Design a protein around this ligand. Structure first.
Ligand SMILES: Nc1ncnc2c1ncn2[C@@H]1O[C@H](COP(=O)(O)OP(=O)(O)O)[C@@H](O)[C@H]1O
Ligand SMILES: O=P(O)(O)OC[C@H]1O[C@](O)(COP(=O)(O)O)[C@@H](O)[C@@H]1O
Ligand SMILES: O=P(O)(O)OC[C@H]1O[C@](O)(COP(=O)(O)O)[C@@H](O)[C@@H]1O
Ligand SMILES: O=P(O)(O)OC[C@H]1O[C@](O)(CO)[C@@H](O)[C@@H]1O
Lengths: 725, 120, 704
């Protein structure tokens, strides 16, 4: 038997995590019990512990919060409580625990496992039979999942919280614009700064205050200088993000009110403070959080099955896009050590302890917020060109912004090419500066413009422009055509010397079909649009009852959107190109759905990637389900279309765009401090790492006929859709 | 495939199923014959059917007129029924008709359905 | 020449208002100038006054300023002013019109020629638009309800009480209408203080909620909430009170300036557009004898209210507030304010069961047609008003399908708790009509002793009523009072100008159109052909077209041919020469049997070759939507409450007048016998014969 509970602050995605624990549990043939109101429900026992069936967790995954409740329980901190808690579990035969919560909830579970010796006091007291003390003894497997928006310890709810913050910032930006105003926004993260940092990065904030890294003396003047510069630059508003637990090098709090006093005093600007508060914990879970929570739920169940008495309690986690089990005790220690470092004022150590990507976000943030005066930037005599190629993808503008500003910070001269290779061939090229890309981070589309056309038939005109504009390097932000483009330019090197320069691309496309990257800029935005659209369609179906929607999604031959969207939306099926399916597979899902209509959940959702089959079209499927569903359910078909691309990029796509482009520019600058295969590369994400791969080496790994990679990491998740539905 | 045999299982649907499940073994083509089926010159059978049945209808009209109408029996279909050509009041044919699909309820040729199995 | 400016606090929709003043201005053959930075830009002059073309879309409190302001206008030949702002901005314009004859001081000084003093004299036409129904209110309300919906998930988890401070130091309309829209547990308004003993009353309500097992409380507090002694009631004091008396876990959130931000709702965009057009017209029609006015929307008609009278009105409310003429304050806010207030209190506070005087009647509630956002709010309201009136409420599930199958169960006050913000239909809704199931349904009415019927639904609800009316002679079980409220995304129910759900759909369409335009910056030279829902009813395509700034919206109610199509293609082709190289064409799904979404896509593609390309998108059932907009929540709630009052009244006493549609008609909500609606209905296409919104078709040409 398995008990699942939620403790500490609630986080969006908890319901998904619970959903996945119950369904994976049941699918493996275990019994699963909800424990309501966190530990308190464990202590109180009784109706607070209830067995969960397949039906109990439908309609839950798209909702914020925890449907089974959470609570700070003082009774569990006492020995008396844990004794009663332990007793209640034994009554239900529950020796497997899954705890979803923060630092505190998991330390509580750590403690509970150590003291599972409490069973002896059950023996000494009336409590339990001796057989029980031996039968359930040290047979307490505990697995933890972190669910705090803080990222205190990637955590469930962080992405959702960030969507929340950025929604507020984007809303505030229209009102700050009117006349002129400076806004001071207090965001969550008690003693963690991750949220503030990543929000700042995501909105191009003018200043940020973190607990892990205090400001340093003289910040008051530095900040006011920056704000005066902005007014001189005519920027119609300022945004300053402040972590709840922002502090002095002396550990004194820096409050939002003090920041306001400072700005009004020094500069007399019109200033307002907004404390976002608990809104950050609310709203619907993002696509990322739903998928993350699902993978974690499934992994937590597996960990429990596989656990031995010799194996220590673990926390399931995602490291480098792999499911890992970290010793719970070690993780608890880690969290104390950061606070220790903070208290002792070893602030560099605090940042070190938060991990590689934390320092990455921090350095990248500063680089893009604070421009050294021109005189200070030495300059070197290269011109670096930036371009967009392929369909538009949310996050392209953030990417250009970052590349330009890093380029300028490195003393290059930045050239913007407009309309992809179309504009390139036509000489649509202009210098671009730091100020030009101001405000781009949250802008959807492509401001430079993007086209699909390939360079191959325009090699001479393009070579001319490179010579004409003395172009020393090229950064291409774009999709599969960007990659084909690089291949063409690589091949054209022998006949045109102008292409014997360093060239790199970052992947930007809604489809996520670029070889050399697990992720592409824009796909998270699309997933969020698909997921929201599916939530609605499902509601429509649940209003009518006995209805199945067949929904066509984008992606080309790339199944990423249909598959991940399917998971995030709770679809019953997702047909993709990468997994052949036949009429037997189709009949089988129809029969499954027909069974499902005998239950309470009388809706269905079937996703079909647009190019998944030449014969088994969206209509074909619609017709089969319709005909074989007769008398039990009816269908509707919907082709989502271009609206899936979505609009403004999600916080993930903003920051992906920003970070990955910054990294590409560093590589360009480094190459210029010095032409063959290794100078024409795709900068992609590969399991934990961002890496530069020669386009020549990516050919072997690519299916050119269908424009998808040969190996796609996410196909290992296919079993999850079956299970989770 | 009769054109209206199924609302979902269309000519394309079938074409697609046979194509997909025939992969590696056979391919398909689809063709909708269309209004050519109406036209051209009639076959000898249709000429003579037309001729003979109409002649018979006219005889009946003549005969009815010698009586000189309000009976059900003066409004008829002259049709072929197992060896016989017979006049049937349209009022009596209503019970025998599926008005939704515009077909008769009982169709003699359905007894031949087993033959196609056997002969192909 | 026309000058347009924005003053006072900003509001979402202001840009739409400005857009419409410029375009209507130019279309009428006037010249239009933007005046930047409100009155200051008028005083400073110079580049702060700029002429506007088609493509584009303290010192005033002193006499010295106004003199310079007046001068700057005369230089540009501007004697027509459109001011978009609040109380203060409009009083400023009132004052400026009074003192215009101080063009004379321009004469005495070198200022101006005498000819000018006579040529532009008392020829100052001023028209005002309020931006602080007023433009931006609906948007602000979307903002508040987004925050409340988000907070509800986290309060759930923790069994927590939330105290939310919303805008309104002087006016309580936002807090009131937010409370109504989220089923808040308590509300505090400036116009209506609580009354003594509220502390205990509020705590009693919260304890009752816990006993009812409600996992959270939401208390909405206007910024300027006050006691009968005008002392502030703050959100902190409310928190102290709850923690003290009940010891519940309580948190306070001050929404702040978020409420002024975000994108304009569909309603605000359309409202602003109609107000902009109406402001220009008012200016043209104005004479020197004509007083300065404020354009407004009263009962869905464009009206011009004297500006001076409106200023006086505003003072009078603050005056009443000063001496505790609190009833007078509420009186002065208007009929619909008191309406919202009474409806809110009815649904928030249940008298103890012993207290409520019982009818012996059972009243049934049902959903019929496709799902529409706001249906659950409607059920909630009807149920609770029914119980408050001492009836027993029966929920019928799955429309007439469940009705024929006896899927009927008593439902109570607690059962409908939390429904207000829930999309879909929780009872379930089906399209099937009662006609072939009259005996089975008659049986259920008899079996469950059903005394009246409220149907929340679409055109099938109306057909259903017709069938049940006709079946009265053969079945006495249908000789009961029956009423329907319109719920459908399509807005095609005869007898109503609006239906529950359509606003939500409009907002979905509008948001989707915005998103498409935000993407696609990359190709430029693109036109989207977008298919919308509505059946034969063009409301969604048309109103969506306006809100989204579409270039065309093809609908069934206005035949169009290949010439009309060729003509819009040529127009768009011209538009691609300009800077604004992105086109939007909406197509109602049933607007033409031959001229399909693909047809149009194909024509525009082929004739646009070398100039632009197209994409098509069929939006689909997402339009049925997710959570209802604040307007649909409150429409649902209010209209259903009203229907239940009518039912209770009828039961205190069958013919044509007992089977009715409760619909909105020009300023009024009215009960219309279904027999009288037949003549007014096109049954073949399921739309009304006369549709109020078709008078707006010219606007899209003008505003595109
Ligand atoms: N050191 C501990 N020992 C026992 N239980 C704990 C401990 N720390 C936290 N808890 C449990 O977790 C709950 C509070 O969680 P908290 O400390 O806020 O961390 P988080 O909210 O991040 O999980 C309490 O109800 C308590 O039962
Ligand atoms: O998959 P790609 O070729 O990177 O392009 C992404 C976009 O292109 C599409 O295939 C549609 O093509 P268009 O943008 O040219 O209309 C969508 O799937 C997706 O939005
Ligand atoms: O216009 P109606 O018939 O009242 O129904 C409203 C809904 O029905 C639709 O026509 C769709 O019908 P279906 O749900 O049966 O496919 C949409 O136009 C609209 O959302
Ligand atoms: O929900 P409470 O009790 O206000 O706690 C607030 C704290 O909890 C957190 O959500 C951490 O889990 C932080 O956002 C915040 O610092």
């Amino acid at each position: 038997a398995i008990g699942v509970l939620t403790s500490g602050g609630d986080a969006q995605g908890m319901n998904a995590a619970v959903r996945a624990v119950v369904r994976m549990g049941i699918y493996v043939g275990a019994k699963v019990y909800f424990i309501y109101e966190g530990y308190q429900g464990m202590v109180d026992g009784g109706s607070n512990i209830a067995e969960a069936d397949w039906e109990s967790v439908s309609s839950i995954l798209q909702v914020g919060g925890t449907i089974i409740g959470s609570a700070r329980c003082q009774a569990f901190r006492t020995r008396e409580g844990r004794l009663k808690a332990a007793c209640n579990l034994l009554q239900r035969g529950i020796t497997n625990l899954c705890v979803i919560g923060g630092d505190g909830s998991l330390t509580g579970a750590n403690l509970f496992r150590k003291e599972w010796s409490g069973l002896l006091e059950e023996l000494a007291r009336n409590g339990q039979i001796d057989k029980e003390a031996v039968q359930k003894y040290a047979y307490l497997n505990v697995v933890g999942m972190v669910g705090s928006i803080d990222n205190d310890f990637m955590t469930i709810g962080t992405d959702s919280a960030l969507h929340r913050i950025i929604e507020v910032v984007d809303a505030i930006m229209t009102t700050a614009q009117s006349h002129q105003r400076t806004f001071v926004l207090e965001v969550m993260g008690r003693h963690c700064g991750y949220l503030a940092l990543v929000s700042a990065l995501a909105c191009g904030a003018d200043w940020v205050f973190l607990p892990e890294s205090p400001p340093e003396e003289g910040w008051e003047e530095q900040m006011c200088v920056k704000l005066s510069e902005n007014r001189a630059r005519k920027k119609r508003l300022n945004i300053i993000i402040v972590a709840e637990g922002a502090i002095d090098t002396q550990n004194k709090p820096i409050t939002s009110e003090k920041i306001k006093e400072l700005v009004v005093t020094q500069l007399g600007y019109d200033t307002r403070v907004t404390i976002l508060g608990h809104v950050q914990r609310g709203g619907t879970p993002s696509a990322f959080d739903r998928i993350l929570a699902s993978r974690m739920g499934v992994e937590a169940v597996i960990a429990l099955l596989e656990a031995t008495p010799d194996t220590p309690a673990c926390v399931v986690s995602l490291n480098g896009n792999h499911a890992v089990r970290l010793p719970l005790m070690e993780c608890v220690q880690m969290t104390q050590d950061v606070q220790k470092a903070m208290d002792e004022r070893r602030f560099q150590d605090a940042v070190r302890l938060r991990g590689r990507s934390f320092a990455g976000n921090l350095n990248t943030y500063k680089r893009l917020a604070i421009k050294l005066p021109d005189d200070q930037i030495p300059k070197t005599n290269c011109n670096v060109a930036v371009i967009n190629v392929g369909a538009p993808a949310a996050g392209m503008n953030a990417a250009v912004r970052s590349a330009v500003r890093v380029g300028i910070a490195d003393g290059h001269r930045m050239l913007a090419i407009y309309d992809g290779f179309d504009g390139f061939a036509k000489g649509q090229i202009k210098e671009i500066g730091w100020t030009d890309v101001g405000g781009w981070t949250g802008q959807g589309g492509s401001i430079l413009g993007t086209k699909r056309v390939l360079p191959g038939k325009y090699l001479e005109e393009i070579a001319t422009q490179m010579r004409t504009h003395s172009i020393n390097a090229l950064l291409i932000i774009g999709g599969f055509e960007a990659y084909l483009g690089l291949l063409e330019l690589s091949a054209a090197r022998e006949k045109h010397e102008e292409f014997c320069v360093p060239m790199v691309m970052v992947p930007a496309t809604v489809s996520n079909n670029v070889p050399g990257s697990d992720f592409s800029i824009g796909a998270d935005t699309a997933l969020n649009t698909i997921t929201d659209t599916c939530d609605r369609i499902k509601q429509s179906a649940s209003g009518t009852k006995r209805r199945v929607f067949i929904i066509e999604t984008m992606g080309g031959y790339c199944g990423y959107l249909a598959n991940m969207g399917g998971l995030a939306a709770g679809a019953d099926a997702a047909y993709i190109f990468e997994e052949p399916f036949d009429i037997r597979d189709l009949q089988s899902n129809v029969e499954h759905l027909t069974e499902k209509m005998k239950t309470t959940i009388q809706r269905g959702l079937v996703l079909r990637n647009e190019s998944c089959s030449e014969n088994y079209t969206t209509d074909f499927i619609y017709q089969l389900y319709s005909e074989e569903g007769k008398g039990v359910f009816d269908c509707r078909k919907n082709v989502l279309g271009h609206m899936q691309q979505g609009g403004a990029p999600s916080p993930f796509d903003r920051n992906f765009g920003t970070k990955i482009s910054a990294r590409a520019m560093e590589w360009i600058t480094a190459k210029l401090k010095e032409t063959t295969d290794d100078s024409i590369c795709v900068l992609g994400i590969s399991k934990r790492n961002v890496i530069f791969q020669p386009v020549a080496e990516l050919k072997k790994q690519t299916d050119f006929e269908h424009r998808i990679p040969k190996e796609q990491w996410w196909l290992k998740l296919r079993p999850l859709m079956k299970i989770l539905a | 495939r009769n054109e209206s045999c199924s609302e979902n299982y269309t000519t394309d649907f079938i074409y697609q199923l046979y194509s997909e499940e025939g992969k590696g073994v056979f391919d398909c083509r689809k063709n909708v014959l269309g209004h050519m089926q109406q036209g051209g010159a009639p076959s000898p059978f249709d000429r003579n059917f037309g001729t003979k049945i109409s002649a018979r209808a006219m005889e009946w009209i003549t005969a009815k007129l010698k009586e000189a109408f309000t009976t059900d029996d003066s409004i008829c279909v002259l049709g072929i029924s197992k060896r016989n050509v017979i006049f049937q009041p349209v009022a009596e044919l209503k019970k025998q008709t599926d008005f939704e699909h515009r077909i008769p309820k009982e169709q003699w040729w359905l007894k031949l359905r087993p033959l196609m199995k056997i002969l192909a």
